[PDB]
Structure 1
């Protein structure tokens, strides 16, 4: 993955305004609601019975915070996403057997959350830069399948 300096500036300027305690839970909760087969992997999380139950589930929020921290790490290492995500790839591919299409889906749910939270500031060029980021994260996470 290829971000120009102007894209990197756009990406990191927005990211500095992200609430890192909340956005990862919003994205994970929306993944579980919008793509409900993904719930197969979260049986121990308890109540996922309704959108409100999912979004207010404290385990979704807490786990989402971990997910977002991994995205933050990718943002800090755009030129070595593979190294950055190696152990997470071993976990998600070799141990959990998550189909890697779902990595793309979660990246795109995060893009939708950023659009929702930033509104007109999430311009088409800013989105294009974030699509490069979430594509690179998904590809790195899927490395153990390649």
Structure 2
């Protein structure tokens, strides 16, 4: 990732309004609903049979806050994502076997959640800057596969 001071400032500014506790659960639950093959990594979380089953699932919600916490930390360390995600990359690639494409899907779901939450404040250059970050994060997490 290479953001201009203006992109970075825009990015960190909007992120500060984010209720991660909330956005985390919405992003992960929407991933499971929209791209249903992703449910396979979470088959032990219980009932993932209906959109309601997914969205209010306590394990889904709890996990999404975790994922989002890691994301916030990538945002503060844009200069060393590879470093920052070093151990998470070994976990996902080596142990979990998460397809790199799935990281791209969650990135896109997150963008859509931000749009949904911020409406108007989520401008084209803000979306463009967010796309660069999510691609950057996806890249750092699939690191162990490169």
Q: Same fold (TM over 0.5)?
A: yes
SS across alignment from 2:32 = helix
State the shift of 1:43 in Å. Answer: 1.1
State the shift of 1:113 in Å. Answer: 0.2
SS across alignment from 2:44 = helix
Asked if 1:75 corresponds to 2:75, the answer is: yes
SS across alignment from 1:21 = helix
Distance in 2, Cα, partners of 1:125 & 1:50 = 35
State the shift of 1:85 in Å. Answer: 0.7
Deviations 1:64-98 (A, max 9, x none): 00000011001000000001111111111010111
Q: How many positions carry a matched residue from both structures? A: 146
Distance in 2, Cα, partners of 1:21 & 1:141 = 21
Unmatched segments (≥5 aa) in structure 2: none
Distance in 2, Cα, partners of 1:63 & 1:123 = 29
Distance in 1, Cα, partners of 2:100 & 2:76 = 22
Unmatched segments (≥5 aa) in structure 1: none
Distance in 2, Cα, partners of 1:124 & 1:92 = 31
Q: What is the root-mean-square deviation of aligned Cα atoms in Å?
A: 0.6
Deviations 1:22-59 (A, max 9, x none): 10110000111111111111011101111111000111
Q: Which runs of 4+ in 1 moved over 6 A?
A: none
Q: Which residue of 1 aligns with 2:131?
A: 131
Distance in 2, Cα, partners of 1:51 & 1:84 = 33
Q: Structure 1-normalised TM-score?
A: 0.98
SS across alignment from 2:85 = helix
